[PDB]
Design a protein around this ligand. Structure first.
Ligand SMILES: Nc1ncnc2c1ncn2[C@@H]1O[C@H](COP(=O)(O)OP(=O)(O)OP(=O)(O)O)[C@@H](O)[C@H]1O
Ligand SMILES: O=S(=O)(Nc1ccc2[nH]c(C3CCC3)nc2c1)c1ccccc1
Ligand SMILES: O=S(=O)(Nc1ccc2[nH]c(C3CCC3)nc2c1)c1ccccc1
Lengths: 350, 349
């Protein structure tokens, strides 16, 4: 109802948490936020507790904390990371500095499952079903992930999959660390900064992921922008004139025009032995033109997922109000907005 | 190697030999789905279990091998036994699905309570058979861990079998199956007190035994916290002997923060009952796992004086579980599993 807090020192810093959380171990893989695992005595599960670092050091930082928290609260779906709890040890807005996020301590990512395993077709079919089911939900709330990669996908011992860590990298030129292996799953139209772009950028990534799971190899492992785009045009072929007109950027259009012609390969030969339905689906996902690329909803209806597909068990998100975006507030307003979200948090029904 | 046919029930693909006809989903199973069917060769209703995603993880791979080794070893009248185990794959390369076949039972113990009112003499017969089966299971160094009315079942002859063992994985709290559903689990597992011995199974048998003697369930709990209240209302708060046995110091905080309540005499609870029944329950529903009676000792209790024959309450052959210490890859677990499918010999007649 109104928990009692207890204090302790872990990461060379004080951790003041509800006493329901116990045995806090700093099993942390990442900075810009410190995380511990703990035993939640109420639910009787193991959890991850993330203490946000310097959440309100800046307007940019105050705005990012509010954006992150608003989204995390909104996302209630089996195939999407959810918030078990959010709390502050502060009893007042006057005394408010720390924000803590609690989620399920999720298992290994998708890479750790797929070393060079070609993965059985039934296995890939279940995994990609779940990503798409999750994307349908996320896209329905007018959100685009944009960084979707195997390390953003947690998987159970039962192959139940959740989508993690949505887009913090808004638009190419932003917080892009690792410019080697990150770009392997990124849609061309955002790599090359065309105007032509929609939610199906995530679908390109799903295509790359699915291909990897079937083949056991990264599909487009490029050493840089140039080698990346070269590997891509080798498989899908160079843009038709329909696509060239829809591009607005002149540097973008003339750059592509320079590239020598390349035919769209036959995917059945590239993915030899593979389920014909899978190959057909790959062909609908790995397309250059965003207007032509298959959406999450449509992919879900693809025959490849016949066994799993049930439109009544593929929910959409409630409408998500993003009007706080492009608003001009001081850092205190942003802080107070964040406080309200912490204070009014209700756990999801169990 | 017979002919297979394909089919879809419950968002899964079923590829079974032609001899199994008229499949139909009859509820769920432990890491699988179970369909009733008619065997054309023997003219017998059979249950067919499709293992769920047997080799998609190391944990599933091992749980699959464990389950199959177990069912292959179990040969007792009060325990489920394999009639058949098959795969559609004709090579280890192609081996992805595993199917288990057993006799189709008449009804579980939820649909016998529903059915008719249990005369004390019938309860004795049913509980005798559960214990007889437990003695066998326990003699192979196996704990069931999740014994409940849905995991017990009866023929037309009131011949009872134990179904669906527990998967040996600490997986405490978090359930290696479905979310929510307790009632028959002993407290020492719910709170992780100390070293749980085979008598945790006995705690379940008592709860079942009571629910048979009296229409209502013994500990109808809402959540973990509630369940404990219910359990302590009847049993009474732990003693200083137990407090010392409980190695978890976190658990101490909770117990000593609760209100102390003395032990109820079971006559008052189970009014009108057979005194031997009450007396047996006392020994089953004790809180200390050291003094809790065993399956073997329970069979000897005077309550079963009509049924007890020591020369016909057998134990299992030596079961080798040295695999349990091994850490392998999926294809190693799979390969070992494949060897077990291929080797399998159906029981005579
Ligand atoms: N004055 C500031 N107030 C608040 N946040 C700031 C400020 N300056 C930078 N930041 C935030 O921190 C980022 C830069 O921090 P940076 O990682 O360079 O620091 P550091 O690694 O701790 O220091 P250094 O690299 O000098 O050892 C900016 O992108 C912004 O998000
Ligand atoms: O921890 S994550 O697994 N990965 C991650 C990667 C980059 C991140 N950048 C930030 C912002 C700095 C404070 C918030 N959080 C980040 C977290 C994670 C888990 C759940 C949701 C989101 C992220
Ligand atoms: O032990 S099983 O995991 N489960 C099981 C077994 C027999 C059953 N017979 C019935 C009848 C339908 C109502 C009673 N259910 C049953 C459930 C199992 C099933 C198949 C092969 C191996 C193990």
């Amino acid at each position: 109802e109104r928990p009692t807090f207890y204090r302790q020192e872990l990461n060379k810093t004080i951790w003041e948490v509800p006493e329901r959380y116990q045995n806090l171990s700093p099993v942390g893989s990442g900075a810009y936020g410190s995380v511990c695992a703990a035993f939640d005595t109420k639910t009787g599960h193991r959890v991850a507790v993330k203490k946000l670092s310097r959440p309100f050091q800046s307007i940019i930082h105050a705005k990012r904390t509010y954006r992150e928290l608003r989204l995390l609260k909104h996302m209630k779906h089996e195939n999407v990371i959810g918030l078990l709890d959010v709390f502050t040890p502060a009893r007042s807005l006057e005394e408010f500095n720390d924000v803590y996020l609690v989620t399920h301590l999720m298992g290994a990512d998708l890479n750790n499952i797929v070393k060079c395993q070609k993965l059985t077709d039934d296995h890939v079919q279940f995994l990609i079903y779940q990503i798409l089911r999750g994307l349908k939900y996320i896209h329905s709330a007018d959100i685009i992930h944009r960084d979707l990669k195997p390390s953003n996908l947690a998987v159970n011992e039962d192959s139940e999959l959740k989508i993690l860590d949505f887009g913090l990298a808004r638009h190419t030129d932003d917080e892009m660390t690792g410019y080697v292996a990150t770009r392997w799953y990124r849609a061309p139209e955002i790599m090359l900064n065309w105007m032509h772009y929609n939610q199906t950028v995530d679908i390109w990534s799903v295509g790359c992921i699915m291909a990897e799971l079937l083949t056991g190899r990264t599909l487009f492992p490029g050493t840089d922008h140039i080698d990346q785009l070269k590997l891509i045009l080798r498989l899908v072929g160079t843009p038709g004139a329909e696509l060239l007109k829809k591009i607005s950027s002149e540097s973008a259009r003339n750059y592509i025009q320079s590239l020598a012609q390349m035919p769209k390969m036959n995917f059945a030969n590239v993915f030899i032995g593979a389920n014909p339905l899978a190959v057909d689906l790959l062909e609908k996902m790995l397309v250059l033109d965003s207007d032509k690329r298959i959406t999450a909803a449509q992919a879900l209806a693809h025959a490849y997922f016949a066994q799993y597909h049930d439109p009544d068990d593929e929910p959409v998100a409630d409408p998500y109000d993003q009007s706080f975006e492009s608003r001009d507030l001081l850092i205190d307003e942003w802080k107070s907005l964040t406080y309200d979200e912490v204070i009014s948090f209700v756990p999801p029904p169990l």
